[PDB]
Design a protein around this ligand. Structure first.
Ligand SMILES: [Tl+]
Ligand SMILES: [Tl+]
Ligand SMILES: [Tl+]
Ligand SMILES: [Tl+]
Lengths: 66, 66
DNA sequence: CATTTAAGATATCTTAAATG
DNA sequence: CATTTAAGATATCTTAAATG
């Protein structure tokens, strides 16, 4: 089963931006992005919603996929 | 001005259910519900989404008011 | 260079006791 | 009774160092 982190990374790669660039858009460090993408952690409520807008997708898609 | 916890409590009061009943719907303790309502903590990503569904509103409404 | 690892501060949860 | 407070375990961040 596909993890949220893999969905985050795939979406970021489609947008052709670095982790630091996505972090700037969300309001977190590049390391936070790395942690989410590798499923070390999951974004908190505020960060998940900011991340979903930066990635142009729904929070539900990130959390649970299709 | 208005805090997310105030919006959570107002939405729960609209449903007329107890914190424990809401916690059961969301997947957390009554105590987590209390901590969110008192703005002591904020829900994580997964919990924010579950809460918004339980309360029949959007995650953005809870987070920022609309 | 871009990203991951590491250490550490603090937030987010838990169950039990206290409160009203 | 419902809710809050207390104590405590794990999760979520940060910056600095390590990696390739
Ligand atoms: Tl750590
Ligand atoms: Tl009492
Ligand atoms: Tl490293
Ligand atoms: Tl190197």
């Amino acid at each position: 089963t596909q993890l949220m982190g893999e969905r985050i990374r795939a979406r970021r790669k489609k947008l052709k931006i670095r982790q630091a660039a996505l972090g700037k858009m969300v309001g977190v460090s590049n390391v936070a992005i790395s942690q989410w993408e590798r499923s070390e952690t999951e974004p908190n409520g505020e960060n998940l919603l900011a991340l979903s807008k930066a990635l142009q997708c729904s929070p539900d898609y990130l959390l649970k996929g299709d």
